[PDB]
Amino acid sequence: IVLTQTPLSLSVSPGEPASISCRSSQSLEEYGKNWLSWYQQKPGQSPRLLIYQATNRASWVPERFSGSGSGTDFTLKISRVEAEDAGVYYCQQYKEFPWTFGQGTKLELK
Amino acid sequence: EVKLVESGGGLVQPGGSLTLSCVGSGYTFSSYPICWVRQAPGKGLEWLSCIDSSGSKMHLADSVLSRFTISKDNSQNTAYLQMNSLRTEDTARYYCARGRWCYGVICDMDLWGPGVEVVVSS
Amino acid sequence: HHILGACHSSWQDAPIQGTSQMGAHGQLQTFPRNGYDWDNQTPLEGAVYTLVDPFGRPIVPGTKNAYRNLVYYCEYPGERLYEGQEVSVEGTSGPLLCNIHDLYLDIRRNVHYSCNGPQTPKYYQPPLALASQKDLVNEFPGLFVRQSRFIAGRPSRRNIRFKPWFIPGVINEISLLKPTWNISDQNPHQHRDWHKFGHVVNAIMQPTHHAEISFQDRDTALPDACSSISDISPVTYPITLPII
Amino acid sequence: HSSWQDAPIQGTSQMGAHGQLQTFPRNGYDWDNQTPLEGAVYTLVDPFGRPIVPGTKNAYRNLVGTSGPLLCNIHDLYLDIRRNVHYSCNGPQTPKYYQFPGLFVRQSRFIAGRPSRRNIRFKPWFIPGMQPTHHAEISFQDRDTALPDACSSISDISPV
Amino acid sequence: HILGACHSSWQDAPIQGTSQMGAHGQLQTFPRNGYDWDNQTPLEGAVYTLVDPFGRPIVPGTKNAYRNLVYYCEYPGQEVSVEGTSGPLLCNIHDLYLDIRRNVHYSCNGPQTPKYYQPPLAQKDLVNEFPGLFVRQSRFIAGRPSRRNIRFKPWFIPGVINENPHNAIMQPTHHAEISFQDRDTALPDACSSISDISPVTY
């Protein structure tokens, strides 16, 4: 299993929503258990967490986050961005043996 | 403030042995896992080497399947990453993360610690 | 023969975040500010705070007239009336499989007991078919607190436990060998040990309905699992110790 | 012993004892087969969790303790070991195959949103021949004792 | 009559691959990675570990870290169950009104309870050794659907006590299934079943 994260570069206007697609080359099962995770770099610090499974806000930071998708195509949505939302975003899953990881995609503010 | 306490790294010649530490605070470490997260500098993330929670299943990654022994201590809450037959590949900053279940899926890779550097060369 | 009237509680205010206020028998109860544990002073990092009712119907904080503290009398309250005991109900469960060894398959059923009488805490107690006021009425707290441990290290945990929140209140009037520490005014379990002959020591369980499912992630990879999630109420047991 | 019975038919409603509409509802519908439902999956099961395929001639027939050591903390007004005791009954009152609904409709629901759940409900199909809750509060990293994003809660074979 | 304090001696934590001849013709065992309970049939990830009856793990190969717990036989001094109750509970009712109910557990803490230390009471017929080293099986099954299971198998090895093994073995089960996101709807894919550390013996 290799994850396909696309596109690598995202030009994000401040306030506008952003959509990022991480599509799996293998089936991530069905309406119960389509799994994925999203981690985020903050440069100069430890990388942190912002979205789970491209549905809901991972951290307890406010309601400005979103997400949708299922099956094999996963949509990473944000309602309204901040200045601290820059970095590179890692779509990740480990739901099979022995190990997989994804690529990562970058966010740029305008 | 609660912080991961990570040290014990340094410059080690290849083929050598080094032991690291992931020390936490504010919790009883009675039966709790520990490992690290690799990140080659300027490269995408990956995982290195673990045993099971009490030490039953010894499964590793593809390129590191016979070079790493992982030990902890349930009392002092101090981890250990003991390596053997060191090579050029696994020089990376190692991050000690949190993982659990919320009735059976992954809910955390919660806070990544400070990171000690292991830069190696022949 | 005597008949006791109905009873109720006092409609009170929901607690404010950061308030520490005093109940009877010296037990302080606090509604902590974030970054603190039970004592609200010792260092914790990531707990935010909001209370909870017994039956899963939470309370908006800072709300006047939000809860009624439930009511329960002494066990055998008629025997403390002169200076109404509930019973268990047997039940049967659904079908289930088994396996039998010997030196075979058979089918049986599970059994649980229930009580719903006057000594169960309720909202608006019906009338029941001399002693003072405070020796016969209680204030079992009708609001519980619910804690969230978000502490760095390894790992975060989902520790769901419950604990009461005691406030004094005004109780409506009613229109009609033994250790001394048991029958004194400073025992909360007075209504449980007024008649039991022998010293009483408590036992506390938090039964945890936990489960293990499918796939997980790194740290010890594979099954990296420790978490415990308990019920909605501490199950406190009494134990009679000999005194002679 | 009980006679053989064939499997029911999808989309079919029958009348049994005591004036109740026993039926096998379809997908997207509730028990009445008129009220819409979201994403339910409906199969037929034996009373012990093992599946029976439909369209089967003589699919089924009808029906007519301690634990180990546990540590518990002690508060006095100390570490100690105590055990848990259950009860069971295995006499003539216990239903058996050999000497009730011999089949049960399954309602493998799913309710989405915030919070979500997942409910397995049993409704007794009966052609004549206290609910346990592994309750939940599920969330990724929020305040663990506030309103969550998800849950997961089995209802068992038959409420007591 | 009055008896005294009872315990047993220490042991050695076994290494993986050891099977010592236990009492009454049972061969206890501790299988390696990817093998069944008689160490001959391969499997994907059913790999075994040791924990205490409290749940405390044991590092394998240690010297004098666990002693097998000890309990007393049936009627050596018998005890009656301890009553108790949880808090207020509310569920639905049918009739052809909200009502508050309380459920009642039991407990036993007599001389028949296995303990680290034996309190006195007021040789092979009276005292025994409970197996204090249990084997925790973290069995995993992949595929469609996917379940992981845990069943406990004893390590009945004897110590030394100072101056028929005894049945319906029930394993109570717990289940939980996560649902996420509801576009593709081929088939549901999850269940579970988790036993206890000890057999429910009828």
Author numbering:
A (entry chain B): 2 to 111
B (entry chain A): 1 to 122
C (entry chain E): 107 to 189, 229 to 248, 303 to 328, 361 to 407, 470 to 537
D (entry chain C): 114 to 177, 236 to 248, 303 to 324, 371 to 400, 498 to 528
E (entry chain D): 108 to 183, 229 to 248, 303 to 328, 364 to 404, 480 to 482, 495 to 530
Q: Paper's wording?
A:
The outer icosahedral capsid is built from 8280 major capsid proteins (p72) and 60 penton proteins (H240R), organized into 12 pentasymmetrons and 20 trisymmetrons. Three copies of p72 and five H240R molecules constitute a pseudo-hexameric capsomer and a pentameric capsomer, respectively. p72 is one of the major protective antigens since monoclonal antibodies were shown to neutralize virulent ASFV isolates. All four classes of antibodies recognize conformational epitopes that comprise 2–3 copies of p72 monomers, locating on these exposed regions (ERs).
To define the epitopes of antibodies and expound the characteristics and the neutralization mechanism of the antibodies via structural analysis, we determined cryo-EM reconstructions of five antibodies (B1, F11, C9, H3, G6) in complex with p72 at resolutions of 2.75 Å, 2.98 Å, 3.48 Å, 3.24 Å and 4.36 Å, respectively. As opposed to these, only one G6 is inserted into the central “groove” of the three-fold axis formed by three p72 monomers. Correlated with targeting site, binding of one G6 Fab sterically hinders attachments of other G6 to the p72 capsomer. By contrast, the G6 antibody targets an epitope contributed from all three monomers. Compared to C9, B1 and F11 exhibit a ~10° clockwise rotation, whilst G6 shows a ~30° counterclockwise rotation upon binding to p72 capsomer. Authentic virus neutralization assay revealed all mAbs could partially inhibit ASFV infections, among which the class III antibodies (C9 and H3) had relatively better neutralizing activities and G6 exhibited weak potency due to low occupancy and affinity. G6 mediates relatively less clashes, only locating inside the p72 trimer in all three forms, which is consistent with the relatively weak neutralization activity.
